[PDB]
Amino acid sequence: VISQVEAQRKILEEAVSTALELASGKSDGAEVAVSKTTGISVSTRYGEVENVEFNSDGALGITVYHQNRKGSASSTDLSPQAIARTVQAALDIARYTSPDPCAGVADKELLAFDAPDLDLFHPAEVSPDEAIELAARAEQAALQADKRITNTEGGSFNSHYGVKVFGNSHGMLQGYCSTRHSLSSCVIAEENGDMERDYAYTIGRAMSDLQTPEWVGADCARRTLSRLSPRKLSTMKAPVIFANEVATGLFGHLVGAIAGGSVYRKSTFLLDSLGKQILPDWLTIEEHPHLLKGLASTPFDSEGVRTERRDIIKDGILTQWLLTSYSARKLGLKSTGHAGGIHNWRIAGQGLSFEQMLKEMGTGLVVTELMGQGVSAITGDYSRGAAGFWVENGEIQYPVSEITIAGNLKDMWRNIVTVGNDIETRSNIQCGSVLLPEMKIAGQ
Amino acid sequence: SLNLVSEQLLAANGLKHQDLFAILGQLAERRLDYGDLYFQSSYHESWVLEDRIIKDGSYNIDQGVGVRAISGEKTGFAYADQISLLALEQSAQAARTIVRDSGDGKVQTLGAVEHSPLYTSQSMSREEKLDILRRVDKVAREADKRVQEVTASLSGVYELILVAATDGTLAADVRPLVRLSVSVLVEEDGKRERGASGGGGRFGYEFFLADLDGEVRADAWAKEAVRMALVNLSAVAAPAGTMPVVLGAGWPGVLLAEAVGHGLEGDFNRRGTSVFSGQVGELVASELCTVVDDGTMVDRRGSVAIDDEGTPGQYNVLIENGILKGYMQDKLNARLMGMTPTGNGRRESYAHLPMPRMTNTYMLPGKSTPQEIIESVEYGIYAPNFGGGQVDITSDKFVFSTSEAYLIENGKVTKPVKGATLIGSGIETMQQISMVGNDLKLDNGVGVCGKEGQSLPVGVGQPTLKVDNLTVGGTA
Amino acid sequence: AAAAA
Ligand code: NA
Ligand code: NA
Ligand SMILES: [Zn+2]
């Protein structure tokens, strides 16, 4: 694999240099990104091979600038003649677009000319038959757990490696390799004519970081069986715990509300909140772009800008926006290295286990799965479909479904009671379960 | 048409029909029910207006071949971002490893047949395209002094496809698609809101300058985005609980298209994982309800002259007077269920597997007037527009959020209310339909459907209809 | 299983 990848990396570096040189005589600036991803995706049904898919995907994108006018083009063909056609297409577009002084190559002083090695590349030579056996073991372990498991949506295994190279007309040319592997299963249980589905998974940059297939199947069966025979709650007001797996997404809504694109257009409910305490005074959100092997670590953003350790929220206070080159320029600020999103968020627990949080709440709703859109970027209004469990006397009583939870993000974030030590560790944003004092629940 | 596509995808890349025979032969060395070769090339352009200027544009190209080998439940699949003999050979040799056993080699002779044309095969100048966007900006800003921002975009695709299979299928398509999108922001005394409009279909950009009820279409849509934004600016908190809901005609058909339409896709029903599995012949809906999926609609975004397996688009009655009649299929799931292809085998591109998918999904009209429907409600909600949502076809749940909605009080539409999320069961909701209007419409050409990470252009529609009880996720 | 405009 490693010899294949280094051969690909050389071809990609040449593609970037070729595109920049073709652009250089006819534009004031240019940015070029290329990538190649290769691997396998397999599934099983009742432990037998179902699908075997061989993946091989390439891409080249260019943006050019002249008189502050911009134009872009892309191709999946990386031959020199296809590159030439792509460059000419972008140049032709920039003849007709209007001058816009916030557009252009990122500032030279912010570029990662000498980008750090973040150890994201851990290849495996997994054969299709080996892949199928991992997926089959996970699915079989789930199916064997309980006689109420009467159907399946299968086992799945994925393993891929990638190479990415970025260059621009300030002279940056840097690239890096990465890997991702995952294993999952999803089964169906039934009780009294009512069917429910759930899943479990493991993910990592190295194969030796994954949970076992038997762990995955056990977790899948546990989750699926816990959903059986739910109740539809009556309409009420009650306390709500966002379980860890959905609490990460609750903090996730911050990203859209502090993104520079929404801030300069005045299309965010947090427009007037920079420097304000929007979360509890004990709560800090840490961004860590340079964690070794990190799931969302990156040595530079999609515009080649350096990524930095930052506390986005510090003691409850909003400390900065999430900016790109264009949105920074609209605001009179500098890029914060957020072109392409956020880069590992961490929120510490305040001491309690999930069990201790149930005891503190006493009576209320735990949400474990959320559905739909239902979140307004401009107002903060929140209304989402939910499934989970009803809690009384500090103990889970029964599963619930076919209900909504509603509020406004400003009030929800400000009045968080606590965050648990039960940290979800498979995602970009990582935190434990979160307790809120009240939401409006719609049902019967 | 088959000749024209063959010259562009095969002859121009050094391939002949005998190369197709050779590669299908390589697949049929193994014990297979079916194999196919799928060729594609496309070009995509876009232009964007914002801050009263032509801010951006793009030109994107893709091309390639995908190869499948199928035995019973099983599929092997490989592909390449190029069209060449070597890419075909490498892809076939990888895909056929799904089964080790030898086959008899007995394929059916390749032979094309005619199908009905459903859409045409720069048609406008660059400055004329950009003038559509300039016109939208001018009309939106002129409509109300509170309009502060306008983003308008034009998108166009030209796509060629050719499919050849071991069952003798040899077919081609030429697929145009255009879309105009408009978004506006309004401001008053420090309060801001947004509204949107647009659409399109399988034709050129001239559609956007044609007549819509006595005005230029682009002008009408610019004004609609402003109207929507101002309704939202005035809207108050929505009520919470179970109550009657009147769903508007057109795009609000997305709610049942998604919940019931995905429920009736043949892959879920073959596996037994849909709530509709084994229910053919049963009453799954009010007797007032007939639901169709229709791939045959001339010029529509959701239509398929052929699907991605070469099966011509069809008018498929899924539910008729409340009774479940059958399922949407691809070739794989039709064989396993003992049924036949329906024209629903669709794939996002050559780099993805086909599966059963929707085309244009809608409910047929009934006998009530929309006025009669509204007059029947003492207290409830009227919902003429939605954003998006999500469905669970196993436990039978849907979740969809309103984008324009009102209270109904004493049989009249009254106060506008803010985004609310509606939740319910697909079967229970259809059984709660007590009135069906005489005002069928489809969406303007905006639908996008996702399944297993694959996004496709679709249509949705319905008349006005009344759901007697549905949970509304407001705050009040 | 997720649709939008
Ligand atoms: Na230059
Ligand atoms: Na026909
Ligand atoms: Zn869909």
Numbering used by the authors:
A (entry chain B): 7 to 450
B (entry chain A): 2 to 122, 127 to 481
C (entry chain E): 601 to 605
Task: List sentences quoted exactly from the publication behind this structure.
We have constructed His262 and His267 alanine substitution mutants, of which His267Ala was not folded correctly and His262Ala was catalytically inactive but, surprisingly, had wild-type Zn/Fe content as determined by ICP-AES. a We have used a two-part dataset naming convention comprising the TldD variant type (WT, wild-type), plus a shorthand for the ligand bound at the active site, where PO4, phosphate; DRVY and HPF, sequences of angiotensin fragments; Act, actinonin; hex and pent, adventitiously bound hexa- and pentapeptides. H262A-pent peptide ligand was refined with occupancy of 0.5.
Both proteins are essential for the activity; however, only the TldD subunit forms a novel metal-containing active site within the hollow core of the heterodimer. Peptide substrates are bound in a sequence-independent manner through β sheet interactions with TldD and are likely cleaved via a thermolysin-type mechanism.
